[PDB]
UniProtKB/Swiss-Prot annotation:
Function: During virus replication, may deplete host UNG protein, and incude G2-M cell cycle arrest. Acts by targeting specific host proteins for degradation by the 26S proteasome, through association with the cellular CUL4A-DDB1 E3 ligase complex by direct interaction with host VPRPB/DCAF-1. Cell cycle arrest reportedly occurs within hours of infection and is not blocked by antiviral agents, suggesting that it is initiated by the VPR carried into the virion. Additionally, VPR induces apoptosis in a cell cycle dependent manner suggesting that these two effects are mechanistically linked.
Note: HIV-1 lineages are divided in three main groups, M (for Major), O (for Outlier), and N (for New, or Non-M, Non-O). The vast majority of strains found worldwide belong to the group M. Group O seems to be endemic to and largely confined to Cameroon and neighboring countries in West Central Africa, where these viruses represent a small minority of HIV-1 strains. The group N is represented by a limited number of isolates from Cameroonian persons. The group M is further subdivided in 9 clades or subtypes (A to D, F to H, J and K).
Entry PTM: Phosphorylated on several residues by host. These phosphorylations regulate VPR activity for the nuclear import of the HIV-1 pre-integration complex.
Cellular compartment(s): Virion; Host nucleus; Host extracellular space
The name this protein goes by in its record: Protein Vpr
Amino acid sequence: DTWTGVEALIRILQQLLFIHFRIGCRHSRIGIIQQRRTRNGASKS
């Protein structure tokens, strides 16, 4: 084994997850963009 390369694969995988929480916070959950987005309850019905 060479464990520094295995470690380097899990450091990119937790960075892409950190990125998914930062971009998903400014998409869903801005100032009530979760229950009411455009229509109240469903997204658009």
